[PDB]
Design a protein around this motif. Structure first.
Motif, PDB file in Angstrom:
ATOM      1  N   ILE A  24      18.674  59.441  71.174  1.00 38.19           N
ATOM      2  CA  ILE A  24      19.417  58.961  70.034  1.00 38.19           C
ATOM      3  C   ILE A  24      20.283  60.123  69.540  1.00 38.19           C
ATOM      4  O   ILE A  24      21.327  59.915  68.933  1.00 38.19           O
ATOM      5  CB  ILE A  24      18.446  58.497  68.937  1.00 38.19           C
ATOM      6  CG1 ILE A  24      18.060  57.039  69.187  1.00 38.19           C
ATOM      7  CG2 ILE A  24      19.044  58.701  67.564  1.00 38.19           C
ATOM      8  CD1 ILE A  24      19.195  56.042  69.000  1.00 38.19           C
ATOM      9  N   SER A 190      26.377  54.903  68.879  1.00 43.95           N
ATOM     10  CA  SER A 190      25.545  55.554  67.888  1.00 43.95           C
ATOM     11  C   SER A 190      25.850  55.076  66.482  1.00 43.95           C
ATOM     12  O   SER A 190      25.164  55.445  65.523  1.00 43.95           O
ATOM     13  CB  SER A 190      25.705  57.073  67.973  1.00 43.95           C
ATOM     14  OG  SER A 190      27.041  57.474  67.707  1.00 43.95           O
ATOM     15  N   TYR A 193      22.994  52.256  66.314  1.00 43.59           N
ATOM     16  CA  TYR A 193      21.599  52.699  66.377  1.00 43.59           C
ATOM     17  C   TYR A 193      21.261  54.007  65.710  1.00 43.59           C
ATOM     18  O   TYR A 193      20.084  54.323  65.564  1.00 43.59           O
ATOM     19  CB  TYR A 193      21.136  52.794  67.827  1.00 43.59           C
ATOM     20  CG  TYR A 193      21.437  51.563  68.631  1.00 43.59           C
ATOM     21  CD1 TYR A 193      22.596  51.475  69.397  1.00 43.59           C
ATOM     22  CD2 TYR A 193      20.587  50.464  68.588  1.00 43.59           C
ATOM     23  CE1 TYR A 193      22.902  50.325  70.105  1.00 43.59           C
ATOM     24  CE2 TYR A 193      20.883  49.305  69.282  1.00 43.59           C
ATOM     25  CZ  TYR A 193      22.043  49.245  70.044  1.00 43.59           C
ATOM     26  OH  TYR A 193      22.334  48.110  70.751  1.00 43.59           O
ATOM     27  N   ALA A 200      17.573  56.123  63.274  1.00 48.41           N
ATOM     28  CA  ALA A 200      17.375  55.266  64.427  1.00 48.41           C
ATOM     29  C   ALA A 200      16.182  54.316  64.303  1.00 48.41           C
ATOM     30  O   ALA A 200      16.266  53.164  64.722  1.00 48.41           O
ATOM     31  CB  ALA A 200      17.218  56.136  65.666  1.00 48.41           C
ATOM     32  N   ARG A 204      15.420  49.635  63.123  1.00 49.81           N
ATOM     33  CA  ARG A 204      14.793  48.725  64.046  1.00 49.81           C
ATOM     34  C   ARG A 204      13.714  47.916  63.459  1.00 49.81           C
ATOM     35  O   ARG A 204      13.137  48.188  62.415  1.00 49.81           O
ATOM     36  CB  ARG A 204      14.191  49.450  65.227  1.00 49.81           C
ATOM     37  CG  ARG A 204      15.030  50.562  65.748  1.00 49.81           C
ATOM     38  CD  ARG A 204      14.244  51.353  66.759  1.00 49.81           C
ATOM     39  NE  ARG A 204      13.604  50.462  67.715  1.00 49.81           N
ATOM     40  CZ  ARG A 204      13.092  50.856  68.874  1.00 49.81           C
ATOM     41  NH1 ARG A 204      13.142  52.134  69.230  1.00 49.81           N
ATOM     42  NH2 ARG A 204      12.539  49.965  69.681  1.00 49.81           N
ATOM     43  N   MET A 213      16.841  44.403  66.062  1.00 49.81           N
ATOM     44  CA  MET A 213      17.256  45.423  65.104  1.00 49.81           C
ATOM     45  C   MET A 213      16.916  44.748  63.766  1.00 49.81           C
ATOM     46  O   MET A 213      17.115  43.538  63.617  1.00 49.81           O
ATOM     47  CB  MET A 213      18.770  45.677  65.168  1.00 49.81           C
ATOM     48  CG  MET A 213      19.229  46.681  66.208  1.00 49.81           C
ATOM     49  SD  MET A 213      18.596  48.379  66.068  1.00 49.81           S
ATOM     50  CE  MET A 213      19.372  48.902  64.570  1.00 49.81           C
ATOM     51  N   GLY A 252      23.788  52.357  61.715  1.00 51.71           N
ATOM     52  CA  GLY A 252      23.570  53.547  62.509  1.00 51.71           C
ATOM     53  C   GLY A 252      24.501  54.656  62.081  1.00 51.71           C
ATOM     54  O   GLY A 252      24.242  55.836  62.320  1.00 51.71           O
ATOM     55  N   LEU A 270      25.629  44.405  65.481  1.00 48.91           N
ATOM     56  CA  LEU A 270      24.187  44.335  65.293  1.00 48.91           C
ATOM     57  C   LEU A 270      23.793  42.966  65.811  1.00 48.91           C
ATOM     58  O   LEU A 270      22.799  42.819  66.517  1.00 48.91           O
ATOM     59  CB  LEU A 270      23.799  44.443  63.819  1.00 48.91           C
ATOM     60  CG  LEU A 270      22.287  44.527  63.597  1.00 48.91           C
ATOM     61  CD1 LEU A 270      21.882  45.969  63.267  1.00 48.91           C
ATOM     62  CD2 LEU A 270      21.885  43.607  62.461  1.00 48.91           C
ATOM     63  N   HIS A 273      23.445  42.799  69.397  1.00 49.76           N
ATOM     64  CA  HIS A 273      22.247  43.466  69.882  1.00 49.76           C
ATOM     65  C   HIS A 273      21.034  42.540  69.880  1.00 49.76           C
ATOM     66  O   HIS A 273      20.233  42.533  70.815  1.00 49.76           O
ATOM     67  CB  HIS A 273      21.915  44.691  69.036  1.00 49.76           C
ATOM     68  CG  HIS A 273      20.534  45.222  69.284  1.00 49.76           C
ATOM     69  ND1 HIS A 273      20.215  46.000  70.376  1.00 49.76           N
ATOM     70  CD2 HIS A 273      19.380  45.047  68.601  1.00 49.76           C
ATOM     71  CE1 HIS A 273      18.926  46.288  70.351  1.00 49.76           C
ATOM     72  NE2 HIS A 273      18.397  45.720  69.283  1.00 49.76           N
ATOM     73  N   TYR A 293      14.617  46.687  73.405  1.00 44.67           N
ATOM     74  CA  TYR A 293      15.486  47.473  72.537  1.00 44.67           C
ATOM     75  C   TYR A 293      16.364  48.444  73.330  1.00 44.67           C
ATOM     76  O   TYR A 293      17.528  48.636  72.999  1.00 44.67           O
ATOM     77  CB  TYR A 293      14.655  48.279  71.527  1.00 44.67           C
ATOM     78  CG  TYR A 293      15.432  49.377  70.802  1.00 44.67           C
ATOM     79  CD1 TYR A 293      16.075  49.132  69.585  1.00 44.67           C
ATOM     80  CD2 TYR A 293      15.513  50.665  71.334  1.00 44.67           C
ATOM     81  CE1 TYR A 293      16.774  50.148  68.918  1.00 44.67           C
ATOM     82  CE2 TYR A 293      16.207  51.680  70.678  1.00 44.67           C
ATOM     83  CZ  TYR A 293      16.832  51.414  69.470  1.00 44.67           C
ATOM     84  OH  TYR A 293      17.493  52.419  68.804  1.00 44.67           O
ATOM     85  N   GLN A 294      15.809  49.063  74.364  1.00 51.55           N
ATOM     86  CA  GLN A 294      16.576  50.018  75.156  1.00 51.55           C
ATOM     87  C   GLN A 294      17.576  49.377  76.112  1.00 51.55           C
ATOM     88  O   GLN A 294      18.704  49.827  76.216  1.00 51.55           O
ATOM     89  CB  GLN A 294      15.637  50.958  75.928  1.00 51.55           C
ATOM     90  CG  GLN A 294      14.848  51.933  75.045  1.00 51.55           C
ATOM     91  CD  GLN A 294      15.738  52.787  74.137  1.00 51.55           C
ATOM     92  OE1 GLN A 294      16.950  52.869  74.333  1.00 51.55           O
ATOM     93  NE2 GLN A 294      15.127  53.434  73.143  1.00 51.55           N
ATOM     94  N   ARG A 297      20.488  48.130  73.944  1.00 60.07           N
ATOM     95  CA  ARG A 297      21.251  49.284  73.491  1.00 60.07           C
ATOM     96  C   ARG A 297      22.092  49.829  74.627  1.00 60.07           C
ATOM     97  O   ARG A 297      23.193  50.316  74.412  1.00 60.07           O
ATOM     98  CB  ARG A 297      20.291  50.374  72.983  1.00 60.07           C
ATOM     99  CG  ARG A 297      20.870  51.779  72.919  1.00 60.07           C
ATOM    100  CD  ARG A 297      19.966  52.690  72.088  1.00 60.07           C
ATOM    101  NE  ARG A 297      20.486  54.050  71.930  1.00 60.07           N
ATOM    102  CZ  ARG A 297      20.215  55.065  72.748  1.00 60.07           C
ATOM    103  NH1 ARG A 297      19.420  54.876  73.791  1.00 60.07           N
ATOM    104  NH2 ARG A 297      20.733  56.270  72.524  1.00 60.07           N
TER     105      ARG A 297
END
Ligand code: HEM
Ligand SMILES: *[C@@H]1O[C@H](CO)[C@@H](O[C@@H]2O[C@H](CO)[C@@H](O)[C@H](O)[C@H]2NC(C)=O)[C@H](O)[C@H]1NC(C)=O
Ligand SMILES: *[C@@H]1O[C@H](CO)[C@@H](O[C@@H]2O[C@H](CO)[C@@H](O)[C@H](O)[C@H]2NC(C)=O)[C@H](O)[C@H]1NC(C)=O
Ligand SMILES: *[C@@H]1O[C@H](CO)[C@@H](O)[C@H](O)[C@H]1NC(C)=O
Ligand SMILES: *[C@@H]1O[C@H](CO)[C@@H](O)[C@H](O)[C@H]1NC(C)=O
Ligand SMILES: O=C1O[C@H]([C@@H](O)CO)C(O)=C1O
Ligand SMILES: [Ca+2]
Length: 595
Positions: A24, A190, A193, A200, A204, A213, A252, A270, A273, A293-294, A297
């Motif tokens: 992050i 960024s 997030y 970060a 979430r 998120m 973020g 968002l 996401h 989540y990863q 992102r």
């Protein structure tokens, strides 16, 4: 001969070596050097800083002292005599939707931030700046010139506080001040997030391991999500309207609520996401929260990258695109991926693309309600107009149906931003983004306009006649010369922006060069660039290539009709086609049947 490290901002950098997700913090992009492109480090210097006293103090700080033998004109003076105008008719860009301007801001905030510093915070030595207007340590006020109208209504100055710098928050006698970049240099999303683990995380949703998120709880948008409210008080958003009492959003990037259309863009993102996390879960129930989540992102960052380099930079760099961002040859670790100090000023070319009004349009793209069109300035840090006045559909329609402002040598920054800017910690809608840009050019120890022309291999006008030829303007050149006595003294922000635009671009030579190089270093120096072989599979990459800002809207708003190309000027209903027809993001290549 000289140093490897100085710097307050070096917290634990423990790198997880073959991880498939960026940190992050931006840290561990580069394995040869962990810190590059990371958040919370000094901005890169492409040229040595230029300060009045060679170290920290800005030009214009001491009254007796000069720059190249001449005084530096007051920021507000330059702004009044060169930047401003009164007639908005005829200023709109005939080929650039309002989204052109907005994206540029979205990307800008993903790349760099040098926030003001507080050691006299919670103490009126900070409002001692606005009130008494005494220059001091980090208080470096924008003083008003003699005939300034604001002198009659706003005091002696506009308050201004210097940007944060490395190693300390106060003293500097041993090496040249370098300002801090508080966000990651990579086009990595960024702003959605965060650049800090602390933030970060707070963004979430840790309640349900769905990889969502965290969304707003007090309000919803025709069911669709809103960003949580930054439960910080006092809140600037609350301030513009203490009856509405609607706080700013938590994102973020700490700047999201600066203006209503930026907040609108954060929301689509968002939203995207969470729409991604959902479809992924349906496609992979074995996948856990972190995994959802990863991978989301990772997808969103890839989306911001494609749109930027494939849809946004070509029409900003026009003909020069190729001279500076050639074919992606692959990830190269030897490239400095950091944001230069000058770029944070060069990217500001966007301030001259902001129009004076914002419109809300209905399903038939028509002025929405009685107050459909609002003056840009009423919308600074205005979250109430989204929540209690329509949602974001009307604004998103406006971003597509309306146009950006066109840069204009005689009409540079709208007064909505030049006389009516609202700043937090201040009560008034009486600030000047241009005077501010110029006080900041100086605050960062930026070298003059010709050093940068020299840097980019361009001519260095030394006379009035030389400048007119470069600016292709007699009148602008005379005013600039009358103010900066020498083209060598011209602040880079105004000099770069005064140049005529390059063909099929929207910035001139000097700017195409400074911008072009950064984005090249941005792409080439990112281990996680979406097309670096190995970060995605072709099935994945081939699915990526489909994305359109169009699709983002269709999937995140209630709006049926969108243009093919969202950045060029588009008129409804003629350039507007059916959401049902725009190619969607097929996430099948992300289905992993390996349990
Ligand atoms: C209504 C639209 C916008 C508003 C109200 C706005 C407002 C602001 C303000 C108040 C600052 C900080 C100035 C300083 O004290 O240094 C800023 C900085 C900046 N703006 Fe904007 N802005 C807008 C649009 C844009 C756009 C469209 C772009 C680029 C395409 C842009 C690029 C930048 C950059 C690079 C900075 C310096 C960021 C850093 O700290 O590194 N802005 N803007
Ligand atoms: C995390 O997501 C879940 C939904 O996936 C949210 O939990 C809900 O709160 C709503 C209120 O509207 C209630 O209906 C339920 O208690 C929850 N729904 C579900 C599906 O679990 C929660 O809002 C999210 N967490 C945060 C912090 O935003
Ligand atoms: C502050 O916000 C309030 C609430 O958001 C605004 O009030 C509304 O505006 C007019 C009042 O004449 C009505 O048409 C709306 O229906 C009101 N909304 C609600 C929810 O009551 C007000 O305009 C804002 N005030 C200022 C000074 O900016
Ligand atoms: C507007 O710009 C696009 C690409 O940015 C270009 O293809 C097109 O020719 C332009 N349209 C007009 C009408 O000039
Ligand atoms: C990698 O980057 C450095 C600096 O940009 C440069 O010396 C080198 O030519 C680049 N690699 C390739 C293969 O071009
Ligand atoms: O884009 C900008 O807006 C904010 C600010 O006005 C709110 O925190 C800022 O400093 C920027 O760089
Ligand atoms: Ca970033």
């Amino acid at each position: 001969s000289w140093e490897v490290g100085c710097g307050a901002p070096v917290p634990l950098v423990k790198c997880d070596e073959n991880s498939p997700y960026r940190t992050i913090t931006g840290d561990c992009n580069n394995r040869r050097s962990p810190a590059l492109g990371a958040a919370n480090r000094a901005l890169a210097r492409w040229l040595p800083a230029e300060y009045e006293d060679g170290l920290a103090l800005p030009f214009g700080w001491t009254q007796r002292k000069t720059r190249n033998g001449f005084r530096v004109p007051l920021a507000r003076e330059v702004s009044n005599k060169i930047v401003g105008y009164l007639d908005e008719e005829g200023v709109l860009d005939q080929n650039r939707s309002l989204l052109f301007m907005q994206w540029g801001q979205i990307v800008d905030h993903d790349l760099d931030f040098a926030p003001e510093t507080e050691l006299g915070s919670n103490e009126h030595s900070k409002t001692q700046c606005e009130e008494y207007c005494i220059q001091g340590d980090n208080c470096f006020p924008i003083m008003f010139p003699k005939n300034d109208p604001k002198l009659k209504t706003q005091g002696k100055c506009m308050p201004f506080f210097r940007a944060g710098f490395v190693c300390p928050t106060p003293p500097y006698q041993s090496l040249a001040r370098e300002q801090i970049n508080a966000v990651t240099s990579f086009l990595d999303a960024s702003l959605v997030y965060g650049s800090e683990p602390s933030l970060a995380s707070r963004l979430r949703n840790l309640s349900s391991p769905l990889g969502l998120m965290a969304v707003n709880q007090e309000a919803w948008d025709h069911g669709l999500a809103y960003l949580p409210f930054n439960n910080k008080k006092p809140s600037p958003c609350e301030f513009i309207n203490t009856t509405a009492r609607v706080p700013c959003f938590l994102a973020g990037d700490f700047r999201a609520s600066e203006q209503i259309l930026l907040a609108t863009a954060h929301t689509l993102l968002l939203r995207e996401h969470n729409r991604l996390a959902r479809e992924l879960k349906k496609l992979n129930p074995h996948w856990n929260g972190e995994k959802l989540y990863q991978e989301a992102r990772k997808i969103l960052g890839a989306f911001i990258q494609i749109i930027t380099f494939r849809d946004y930079l070509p029409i900003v760099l026009g003909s020069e695109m190729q001279k500076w961002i050639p074919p992606y040859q692959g990830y190269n670790n030897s490239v400095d991926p950091r944001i230069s100090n000058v770029f944070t000023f060069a990217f500001r070319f966007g301030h001259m693309e902001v129009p004076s009004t914002v419109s809300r349009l209905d399903e038939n793209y028509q002025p929405w309600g009685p107050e459909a069109e609002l003056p840009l300035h009423t919308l600074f840090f205005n979250t109430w107009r989204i929540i209690k006045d329509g949602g974001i559909d009307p604004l998103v329609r406006g971003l597509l149906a309306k146009k950006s402002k066109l840069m204009n040598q005689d009409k540079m920054v709208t007064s909505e931003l030049r006389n009516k800017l609202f700043q937090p910690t201040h009560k008034i809608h009486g600030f000047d983004l241009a005077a501010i840009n110029l006080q900041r050019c100086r605050d960062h120890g930026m070298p003059g306009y010709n050093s940068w022309r020299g840097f980019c291999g361009l001519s260095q006008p030394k006379t009035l006649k030389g400048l007119q030829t470069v600016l292709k303007n007699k009148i602008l050149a005379k005013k600039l010369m009358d103010l900066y006595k020498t083209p060598d003294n011209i602040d880079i922000w105004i000099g770069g922006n005064a140049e005529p635009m390059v063909e099929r671009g929207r910035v001139g030579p000097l700017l195409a060069c400074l911008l072009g190089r950064q984005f090249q270093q941005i792409r080439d120096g990112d281990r996680f660039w979406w097309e670096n072989p190995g970060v995605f599979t072709e099935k994945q990459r081939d699915s990526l290539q489909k994305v359109s800002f169009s699709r983002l809207i269709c999937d995140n708003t209630h709006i049926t009709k969108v243009p093919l190309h969202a950045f060029q000027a588009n008129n409804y209903p003629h350039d507007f086609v059916d959401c049902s027809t725009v190619d969607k993001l097929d996430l099948s290549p992300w289905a992993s049947r390996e349990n």
